[PDB]
Design brief:
part of a larger assembly; 5 chains; A mainly alpha (165); B mainly alpha (53); C mainly alpha (179); D mainly alpha (53); E little secondary structure (5); A: 165 residues; 6 helices; 3 strands; D: 53 residues; mainly alpha; 1 helix; binds zinc ion; Gamma-sarcoglycan (chain B); Dystrophin (chain A); Beta-sarcoglycan (chain D); structural protein; complex membrane stability signaling
Amino acid sequence: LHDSIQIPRQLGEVASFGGSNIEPSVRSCFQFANNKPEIEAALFLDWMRLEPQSMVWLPVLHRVAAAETAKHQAKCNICKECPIIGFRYRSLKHFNYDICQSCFFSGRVAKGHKMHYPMVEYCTPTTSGEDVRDFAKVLKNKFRTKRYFAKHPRMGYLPVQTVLE
Amino acid sequence: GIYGWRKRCLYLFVLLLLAILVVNLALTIWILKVMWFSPIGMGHLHVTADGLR
Amino acid sequence: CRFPLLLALLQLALGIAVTVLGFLMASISPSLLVRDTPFWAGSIVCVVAYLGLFMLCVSYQVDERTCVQFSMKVFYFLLSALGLMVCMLAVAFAAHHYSLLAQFTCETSLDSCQCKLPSSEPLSRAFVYRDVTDCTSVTGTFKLFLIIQMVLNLVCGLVCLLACFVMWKHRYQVFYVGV
Amino acid sequence: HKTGLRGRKGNLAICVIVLLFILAVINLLITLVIWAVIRIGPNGCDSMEFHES
Amino acid sequence: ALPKM
Ligand SMILES: CC(C)CCC[C@@H](C)[C@H]1CC[C@H]2[C@@H]3CC=C4C[C@@H](O)CC[C@]4(C)[C@H]3CC[C@]12C
Ligand SMILES: [Zn+2]
């Protein structure tokens, strides 16, 4: 854990992953393993397969490496990019809304719609089943209004959604 | 333009239009064959403003 | 591949069967129009299957992945599509004629199967048949022959549709993600 | 790169659209010729009246 | 962008 967090410490951002305090990670891993005397390979695999807070930089990195040469059949509603190269971000409480990665991280705030709503992240080009499922999710959300849950501050919004390759 | 779902809707629309047009052409040919059509009238039954013949 | 080879074999078997049935139709009596005997569609399916067998031999022999191979794969596909269309048309024609023939009473004459459809008023369509041995023999087995032939072209058309669908699914269903 | 109709496919699509439009216009002309010759109008064939019975 | 219905 210490050797791993050394890399964010070099770049001065280890505080986001919880800082140099590796003990809470040990506490969580033992809580998963019901305080087992020893930890094996499979248990560690399952423990990290659920986005551990301190380790998010391993998968995301590879995920970025998996989305540097991906071309989607869509457009960016803000900068009128066509087609989006790289990541793709789809809205859920709106229809026909998509934004590129740069338009998302930088914050091109077009008047009328904010960016503090749930999103969906796509690395690989999508398929028809994903599109129709997104349509169904949008329709279901359209009748689940009145702000059941809201998150205005950022505080760290890294685990957006899992694509399961 | 015409990137994604717009293309897969336009293609289906064109196919539907082509099928409808083919059916309409068949109906027109059927009409032209049931009535022995000539520029003057149906078969030998000449038709003018005053009446039949 | 193996599946196209099996499809071509089924196509040739069904084509030979329907051609034999059509030849028997013609040989029974010259009382029936060229449309009612679909043996032409059977011959079309037969040449389709011949092209298919040649295709699936040459693909397994040499010149597997060149441009002209696809250039007449498209020919194979369109030819199978026309085969399916002609099979369905034959099904429709046979169904119409069977529907006409299944709801009327017939009587025998000295040399022909003269009879009329049930009529509200004494004038209606009349049908006569060449060289009828018996109006209760040709009519009574003609319906069975028609039903068997209907099943034959229905299966042939389904096979043709599957043959058309398989290669298209091979091309336009899978998209490559990695590189 | 770019997505959609880019090269020869755009020309083929425009040619197919033009051909379909030509066929539709020809069919409309044929139907109009029928209407003019037989004098079909809102009141019927203007020379006969095919009753239901 | 492989085009088909
Ligand atoms: C891996 C192998 C099997 C791929 C072979 C590609 C074949 C199955 C594909 C490639 C291009 C395709 C053709 C492209 C264009 C046309 C014209 C269109 O109006 C109908 C479909 C039709 C006729 C397609 C039929 C299937 C086709 C011939
Ligand atoms: Zn953008």
